[PDB]
């Protein structure tokens, strides 16, 4: 259900308009109330990155073909292959022990060169996020109830990005509406890439990807650089060199990628990346009219963890608590050192954890201190308590 605006959330002017200020989270709904008017439901539908530019490809599976060698006796000059001039080739120049036993008129170091065609079988793609183009869609519609004549209850879909924070819609009764909003992301994209590997995509640290000891290719394509990571030239004997491709490094990457958060790619667009977290702070501008705020009692009755506190990946902890008998009420949440004094020392990420009706399951996100702490939901004897260690 949607959660009703409190009195302080909106402000009505003597002249001009009325302004609502709200923080929109995903999978949650905020409603604006007005006397003898259908309630106005506003919700954050999605936050997305649309077609991020490719910054780098990192090869973890390489295959060698067309291996060619050339050799020269000592003091006859430098040995060369035409393939030395081709970027798709991995080459090495060295010298082997030559003499009478292998077709040379004098003992010594003979020039030997070896090239092989480098094709990357499997690579990880790294995408750069343009933070000024992170998109978000806000859905707004009058609360569907019994049919009222001349009331428009059409859904209004408002498309934003970081640059275009001001969009417009219109409702009956409420009139014209100007929404001025901003995105706050849950992870720092300035320090991050979106990494695509086969079916899957994660959000990874940039420096981690840069420090990978693997061949890479620039965003503007071209040749594969530092091929030597996956190409081995064994020491030469006579007039040959063994040229081997190293093994697939898929396991290393996948192992390292466990300690990294995933990102969902869209189902029917299949080019979008939709983020799970984030806040969207909005000022909604309406023409002057009366709104009805709702007061909220604090949850007193016994609650329960529908889902126990668990790590989210990006430093925060998510829980889901059920409110069986408390009615509509705000869930008191703190994070303390002990159960006695209970002085809050954590950061409540969730904006107003409120259960609309009884038997309703509510998400609560919290940022606990480093070390040992107690996540405390509710107050009094039936309060929920969950120990936690962060590092």
């Amino acid at each position, epitope marked *: 259900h949607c959660i009703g605006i409190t009195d302080r959330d909106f402000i009505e002017g003597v002249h001009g308009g009325t302004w609502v200020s709200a923080t929109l989270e995903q999978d949650k709904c905020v409603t604006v109330m007005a006397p003898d008017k259908p309630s106005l439901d506003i919700s954050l539908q999605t936050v997305a990155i649309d077609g991020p530019a490719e910054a780098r490809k990192v090869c973890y599976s390489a295959v060698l073909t067309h291996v060619k060698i*050339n050799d020269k006796c000592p003091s006859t000059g430098e040995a060369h292959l035409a393939e030395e001039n081709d970027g798709d080739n991995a080459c090495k120049r060295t010298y082997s022990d030559r003499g009478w036993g292998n077709g040379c008129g004098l003992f010594g170091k*003979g020039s030997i060169v070896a090239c092989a065609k480098f094709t990357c079988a499997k690579s990880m793609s790294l995408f750069e996020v343009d933070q000024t183009k992170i998109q978000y869609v806000i859905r707004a519609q009058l609360h569907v109830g019994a049919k009222q004549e001349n009331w428009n209850t059409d859904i209004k879909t408002l498309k934003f990005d970081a640059l275009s924070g001001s969009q417009e819609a219109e409702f009956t009764g409420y009139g014209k509406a100007t929404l001025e909003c901003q995105v706050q992301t849950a992870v720092d994209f300035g320090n991050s890439y979106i990494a695509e590997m086969e079916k899957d995509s994660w959000i990874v640290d940039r420096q981690w990807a840069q420090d990978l000891t693997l061949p890479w290719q620039s965003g503007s394509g071209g040749i594969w650089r530092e091929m030597h990571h996956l190409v081995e030239f064994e020491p030469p004997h006579a007039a040959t060199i*063994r040229v081997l491709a190293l093994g697939n490094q898929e396991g290393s990457l996948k192992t390292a990628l466990t300690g990294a958060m995933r990102v969902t790619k869209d189902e029917n667009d299949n080019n979008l990346y939709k983020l799970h977290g984030g806040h969207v702070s909005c000022r909604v501008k309406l023409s002057a009219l009366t709104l009805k705020g709702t007061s909220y009692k604090m949850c007193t009755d016994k609650m329960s963890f529908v889902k126990n506190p668990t790590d989210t990946g990006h430093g925060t902890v998510v829980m889901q608590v059920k409110v069986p008998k408390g009615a509509p009420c705000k869930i008191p949440v703190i994070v303390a050192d002990d159960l006695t004094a209970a002085v809050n020392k954590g950061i409540l990420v969730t904006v107003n954890p409120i259960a609309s009706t009884n038997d309703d399951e509510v998400l609560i996100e919290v940022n606990p201190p480093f070390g040992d702490s107690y996540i405390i939901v509710g107050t009094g004897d039936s309060r929920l308590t969950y120990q936690w260690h962060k590092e």
Partner: antibody, heavy 120, light 106 residues
Framework: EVQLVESGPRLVKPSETLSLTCTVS????????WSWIRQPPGRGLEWIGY???????NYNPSLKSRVTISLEPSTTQFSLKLNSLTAADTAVYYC?????????????????WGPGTMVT | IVMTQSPSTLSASVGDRVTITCRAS??????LAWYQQKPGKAPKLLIY???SLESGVPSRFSGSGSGTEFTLTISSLQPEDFATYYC?????????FGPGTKLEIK
């Protein structure tokens, strides 16, 4: 840059011997199978034969009786010698390298050729 | 081992997709090479081991087949491509060339 050049008597009389010499530059002749191939004017290609640094050789069965191919590694060159010459031997003669790599197992057949010389 | 080719001659224009066939008397596995030759010039290696391109042969050229029957294919014919194409087995000695397939202009 490996290159081959064939030279010798362009004019030969019948019943004679034929001495052609292929010179290899840009690489040693320790590896690979050094070969001779010919092509009569307007007709197709005929593989004559090869010799290797080891001394192992092979000749086309239709020619084996008259054909000798020798290898001198000292100057990196190999020779073709044909005896009992006839008019059916009037041909363009190419020397070529059969590339063989027994370490990484790559075999490109005849990858480097000479321009060839016309023998009448 | 005896090699044969079909057709003996082919007439095509620029842009045409063409296919030439090579056949060995017995199984030669994948040990077949394709050569391109122009008048007054030495043969040039285009394909090795049945289906691998020499560097740097244009990728419009392809080869396929194993054992007995082989095919060379040019997806989009070009002015350069007009020439005589010889096949050659090199499974065993003596190495054998095909009689060749001439490709000329329409």
């Amino acid at each position: 840059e490996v290159q081959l050049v064939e030279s010798g008597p362009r004019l030969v009389k019948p019943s004679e011997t034929l001495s052609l010499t292929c010179t290899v530059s840009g690489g040693s002749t320790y590896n690979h199978h050094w070969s001779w191939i010919r092509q009569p004017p307007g007709r197709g290609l005929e593989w004559i034969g090869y010799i290797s640094y080891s001394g192992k050789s092979n000749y086309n069965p239709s020619l084996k009786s008259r054909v000798t191919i020798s290898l001198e590694p000292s100057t990196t060159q190999f020779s073709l010698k044909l005896n009992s010459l006839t008019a059916a031997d009037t041909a363009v003669y190419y020397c070529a390298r059969e590339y063989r790599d027994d370490t990484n197992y790559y075999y490109y057949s005849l990858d480097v050729w000479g321009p060839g010389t016309m023998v009448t | 081992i005896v090699m044969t080719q079909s057709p003996s001659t082919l007439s095509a224009s620029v842009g045409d997709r063409v296919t030439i066939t090579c056949r060995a008397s017995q199984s030669i596995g994948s040990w077949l090479a394709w050569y391109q030759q122009k008048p007054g010039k030495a043969p040039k290696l285009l394909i090795y081991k049945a289906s691998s391109l020499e560097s740097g042969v244009p990728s419009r050229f392809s080869g396929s087949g194993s054992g007995t029957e082989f095919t060379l294919t040019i997806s989009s014919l070009q002015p350069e491509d007009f020439a005589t194409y010889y096949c050659q087995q090199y499974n065993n000695y003596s190495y054998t060339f095909g009689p060749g397939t001439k490709l000329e202009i329409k």
